[PDB]
Symmetry: D2
Subunit: 103 residues, 4 copies
């Protein structure tokens, strides 16, 4: 339920950042995974969330797994990253201070 898999090149970067912010607020943590050319997105989302102050990372892992590839006959290999983030202590404030609602 709190999993985001980046692949669709039609989506804007902020879709994922905001989708992660949601899942974090709703579920405390969030998972972010991506393959090959999509790892840049998850990398950038994490840098954004960490820097602006929303979250802290709990696990950051990149592996090389196999992928079913009917064209090549036998599976090819791709880099896959998996990043679990959890809400930071400043998250609630930020998800309000930007809206002038910070109590």
């Amino acid at each position: 339920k709190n999993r985001i898999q980046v692949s669709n090149t039609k989506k804007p970067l902020f879709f994922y950042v905001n989708l992660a912010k949601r899942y974090m607020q709703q579920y405390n943590d969030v998972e972010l995974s991506a393959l090959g050319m999509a790892i840049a997105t998850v990398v950038t989302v994490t840098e954004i969330l960490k820097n602006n102050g929303f979250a802290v990372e709990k696990k950051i892992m990149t592996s090389i797994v196999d992928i079913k590839d009917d064209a090549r006959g036998r599976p090819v290999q791709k880099a896959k990253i998996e990043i679990t983030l959890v809400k930071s202590e400043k998250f609630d404030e930020l998800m309000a201070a930007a809206n002038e609602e910070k109590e």
Copy 2:
């Protein structure tokens, strides 16, 4: 449509697009390579690989902002053609 490759598959290997572009040049002479957002890097890489290795030359390289079904995304369109050293590099590869 037959000579246009759209890069939008994160599972694919870089070479699927480099080799597909080479197979297309063999057929149609030219080949179009396009992509949105995060996939532009791949098209960029493909082109650079083909330019540098001497397989081809570019004819058109255009980047524009398009509306997606509004959300805007960068889209690059690259048209390549076989270079004078193509057929030999292929017969030797």
Copy 3:
């Protein structure tokens, strides 16, 4: 040179370039953003961030292949200008 940002620093945060572009628009109205090879993705992202959030509009978006001191690299050049909603988004940000 004062209104041109060249993205070529892997240590920098995405926002250093988004915010720098916003500070430049405040000064010169427009702002040029350029990059080679792997850095084109960042320029692509910067632009998309500014287009979507409503800060600005593009004027020029060109990608070309250039010789580096020959080795070829893709280079993108993007010129932006403040959008009619700029000053308000900045005074509110």
Copy 4:
């Protein structure tokens, strides 16, 4: 001596792939590290080397460290990847079969 740190945007992808092939032939293994927008390069180099058959990965790690940032006054955070590869059993053959030298 067998370390490659990707940063320079003027370099072609094949510079790194071939530099890694060299360090591997010379030193058995090779290290490949990169920050943020440069992780895509190391990711692609590894996929290339693994797929074409040159190497096997021994360690693949992405972390979020601090970086000195005089402009922001206090360090920002960036993603950093580190990938150690070692020569595969097919490496020697490939670094010859392509040259019609495969004995």
